[PDB]
Amino acid sequence: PREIEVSEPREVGITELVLRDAHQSLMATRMAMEDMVGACADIDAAGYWSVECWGGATYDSCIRFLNEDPWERLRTFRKLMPNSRLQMLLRGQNLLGYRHYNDEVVDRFVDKSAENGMDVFRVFDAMNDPRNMAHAMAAVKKAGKHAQGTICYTISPVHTVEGYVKLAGQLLDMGADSIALKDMAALLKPQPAYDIIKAIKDTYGQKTQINLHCHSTTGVTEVSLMKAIEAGVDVVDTAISSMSLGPGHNPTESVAEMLEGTGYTTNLDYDRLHKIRDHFKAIRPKYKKFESKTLVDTSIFKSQIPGGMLSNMESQLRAQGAEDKMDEVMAEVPRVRKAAGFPPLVTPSSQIVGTQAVFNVMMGEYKRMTGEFADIMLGYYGASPADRDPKVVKLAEEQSGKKPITQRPADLLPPEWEKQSKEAATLKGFNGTDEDVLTYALFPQVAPVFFEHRAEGPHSVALTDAQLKAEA
Amino acid sequence: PREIEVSEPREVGITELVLRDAHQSLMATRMAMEDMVGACADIDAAGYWSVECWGGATYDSCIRFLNEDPWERLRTFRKLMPNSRLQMLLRGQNLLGYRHYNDEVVDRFVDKSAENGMDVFRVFDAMNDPRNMAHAMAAVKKAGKHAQGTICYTISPVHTVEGYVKLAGQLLDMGADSIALKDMAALLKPQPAYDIIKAIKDTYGQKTQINLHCHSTTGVTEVSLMKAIEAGVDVVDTAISSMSLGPGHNPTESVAEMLEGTGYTTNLDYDRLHKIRDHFKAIRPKYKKFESKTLVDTSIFKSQIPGGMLSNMESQLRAQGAEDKMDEVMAEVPRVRKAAGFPPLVTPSSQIVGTQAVFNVMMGEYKRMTGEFADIMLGYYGASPADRDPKVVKLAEEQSGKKPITQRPADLLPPEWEKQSKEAATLKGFNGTDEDVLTYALFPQVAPVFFEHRAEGPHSVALTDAQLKAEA
Ligand SMILES: [Co+2]
Ligand SMILES: [Co+2]
Numbered sequence A, B: 001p002r003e004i005e006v007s008e009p010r011e012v013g014i015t016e017l018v019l020r021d022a023h024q025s026l027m028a029t030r031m032a033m034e035d036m037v038g039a040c041a042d043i044d045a046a047g048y049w050s051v052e053c054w055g056g057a058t059y060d061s062c063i064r065f066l067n068e069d070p071w072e073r074l075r076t077f078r079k080l081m082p083n084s085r086l087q088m089l090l091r092g093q094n095l096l097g098y099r100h101y102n103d104e105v106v107d108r109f110v111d112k113s114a115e116n117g118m119d120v121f122r123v124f125d126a127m128n129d130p131r132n133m134a135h136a137m138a139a140v141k142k143a144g145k146h147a148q149g150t151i152c153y154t155i156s157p158v159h160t161v162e163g164y165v166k167l168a169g170q171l172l173d174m175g176a177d178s179i180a181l182k183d184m185a186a187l188l189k190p191q192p193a194y195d196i197i198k199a200i201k202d203t204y205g206q207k208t209q210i211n212l213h214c215h216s217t218t219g220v221t222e223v224s225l226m227k228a229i230e231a232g233v234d235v236v237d238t239a240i241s242s243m244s245l246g247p248g249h250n251p252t253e254s255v256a257e258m259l260e261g262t263g264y265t266t267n268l269d270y271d272r273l274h275k276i277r278d279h280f281k282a283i284r285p286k287y288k289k290f291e292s293k294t295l296v297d298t299s300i301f302k303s304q305i306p307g308g309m310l311s312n313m314e315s316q317l318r319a320q321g322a323e324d325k326m327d328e329v330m331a332e333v334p335r336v337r338k339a340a341g342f343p344p345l346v347t348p349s350s351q352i353v354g355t356q357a358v359f360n361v362m363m364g365e366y367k368r369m370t371g372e373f374a375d376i377m378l379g380y381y382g383a384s385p386a387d388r389d390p391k392v393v394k395l396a397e398e399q400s401g402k403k404p405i406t407q408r409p410a411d412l413l414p415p416e417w418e419k420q421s422k423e424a425a426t427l428k429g430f431n432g433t434d435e436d437v438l439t440y441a442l443f444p445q446v447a448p449v450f451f452e453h454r455a456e457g458p459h460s461v462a463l464t465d466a467q468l469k470a471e472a
Helices: A021-026 A037-044 A058-064 A070-080 A103-115 A131-142 A161-173 A190-204 A221-230 A252-257 A270-290 A307-318 A326-339 A349-362 A371-377 A390-400 A417-424 A434-442 A447-456 A465-471 B021-026 B037-044 B058-064 B070-080 B103-115 B131-142 B161-173 B190-204 B221-230 B252-257 B270-290 B307-318 B326-339 B349-362 B371-377 B390-400 B417-424 B434-442 B447-456 B465-471
Strands: A003-005 A013-016 A050-055 A086-090 A120-123 A146-152 A178-183 A210-214 A235-238 B003-005 B013-016 B050-055 B086-090 B120-123 B146-152 B178-183 B210-214 B235-238
Touching (some): A037 A070, A050 A070, A058 A070, A058 A447, A070 A086, A070 A434, A086 A103, A103 A417, A103 A434, A146 A161, A161 A190, A178 A190, A190 A210, A210 A221, A221 A235, A252 A270, A307 A349, A326 A349, A371 A390, B013 B210, B050 B058, B050 B120, B058 B070, B058 B447, B070 B086, B086 B103, B103 B131, B120 B131, B146 B161, B161 B178, B178 B190, B221 B252, B235 B252, B307 B326, B349 B371, B417 B434, B434 B447
Parallel strands (some): A013 A050, A013 A235, A050 A086, A086 A120, A120 A146, B050 B086, B086 B120, B120 B146, B178 B210
Antiparallel strands (some): A003 B003
């Protein structure tokens, strides 16, 4: 008499991603602020646990493509959604930048983020190295905000339920207010979702808050969400229905509706959701030049290679004139990943492993290692989920000249704030705020251009209504 | 200690819909035969329980838009997929036609369908009147084929689990080899799926074969599929991933992959699936002029009105110059449905109720009843799931002059084969086969044009590769 234990009837929280991850995932983070503010009042009254609206690649996109100040976007969202918990994605010691920074820059960033209104900080590390999340987490706690330690979910010979439970404990040991299980490539299947969520709950207690973030790329994660809820997950992330599916996420309204009669419920206002849905449905067509063309792709369950990663390599092959080896590269990826210690294949690990895999298929296996790949093998990005091939490590040392380290990389970084401030203050357009210094520290090559054009006001790279009627 | 009983580990069968319902639902049934034959060998070796490839609106589309003989399409599929169980959708006493036919026409149609290779006949009735499915079912049994009685799933004040279990029994009493639960509007939520499938299994026995057909229009049915499998469903219908979601169906590969580790499994060949997926992915862009523009719509859970039905009415309102009443019509639909006995809102019931709802919003409530609506209220389409408003019935009788009947409508129909044969034999192009007579009997207004152009060979209304590069 086969049975499955499920959590008691209860309310499940929902985190809306339409203001950040949905457009990052579906239209290359090009969503203009003027296209979002109109839905803030309804979003604020919908009943969401939190509203993800900052961080991720939006900082870069704001200054690099929309001539928009990220800090002004945060202040506006804070003002237009006063009753909501704002949430952001922060890549640990890397912040929203291109490298690891000295602890004082992390302190500065978190302090100004909280000061400008951020409530929940989802801190994560691409290699799942808890030491790279530790300082950011502490800064979030000092600011009295909600620190959400993140586990990047992946499938590999060394990733197991026990390993995830272990990482959850390390996150709780750093003062994590909640645990985020991050499935960017939609690799989390139903049974594993149930087993992992249940194991964490059984091991650290039902009071342990877990938020599940799954993309819908492979098309199986809405079922995984149902399993996670049966396993007792506290909150699940979704995207309003007119901005969902594909490389995006499962639909907010769909996840809310599917629970009727199960004993589980959300407390979202369907009317507010309807308005938010209609709002983005009217606006989405203008971003048609940035849309993806694949709604469902399960090939990753066999190749371990995320579509975006395969594309980045594919181009590199038809740009090297030998795309007659797309099959040899896909077979090399697993080997490179293995050598690197099976890190999750998310940015930047994915591009690094992918690019290095290409070289090995042409210039010869590890004949020439990129600077990024050498740093991963030498530990400058942190610890890997598994031990790295000492033989491939040694070569990296003889091809770069750097010594292999194993301690938290930021331990070697010297104070840099004062140096960042000085340099930033020489740029035309610098407004003198720490916010601007941070913009310079995070994006040195863009800060200059953004600072002297910011006065024009934010723009949009989306089609205008006029241009839409032109296509028609 | 809350638990849920689930079925024992077992293999779940999969019915592929790419050759029929997927393109009917996603690109108005315009899929050309030359765009499908290339995937037949892989489809035939994939491991599907059945391959839905005929019936539904494909007969109409073949003769009305593709200048293609439906019977030749069936023979080709039979020849290209020799090891597969071919399946079709047949609307009971209506066959694939515009009205109920005399029992001898039903006998003829089923006989020729089986003779040309059809294996599984999914027989259904829009009103869920078992008497309209009875004769077709008997004809399928005489031909020694698989008769699958269908239950059209809907949500209404009179539809309950008990009612569905009752209808299942009536289907089994007509010799049904299996029961199909048909959810065209994606209204079936997870809990109801589990409860209904389980109730049918507990009431008639585990040996009772049930096939679940859910569209993905509302975005909640893949979770319903998982629940149905836990409840013990034998087969679920899916569409290859490159031809899924939206008003279509849940993805074949996604449904297969999500079961890993649950104890449930399918026995599809992932390699074959990959080829079928790539095949249609390369071809789908050419049908871009017939695609729908909404991937997820949950509004039906509140309005009871399927998107397609709302559109058919919407146009009728901006064509009557008063679309300033789209809200008054949506409020009238429920009332008309109620009066009609809560029939499921699928074709043709949906257009009938929808059109009649419009009149009541302008010319006045039941001021003028369409001929179709009068026939429904008078019982010429069969019995309704609930009793019809005697007051609205009486008016229908005084507005049409027909007397209200309650027995199976085909009981009044006289023999017509000989008359159909004679008339058809006078058409230029008639080849003298019963197949052609059937084409004339089912589509009197199209048969003429099709018969004199058929010699040109089937065509395609899809964009050519050249026209595609033109748009680019
Ligand atoms: Co994400
Ligand atoms: Co269907």
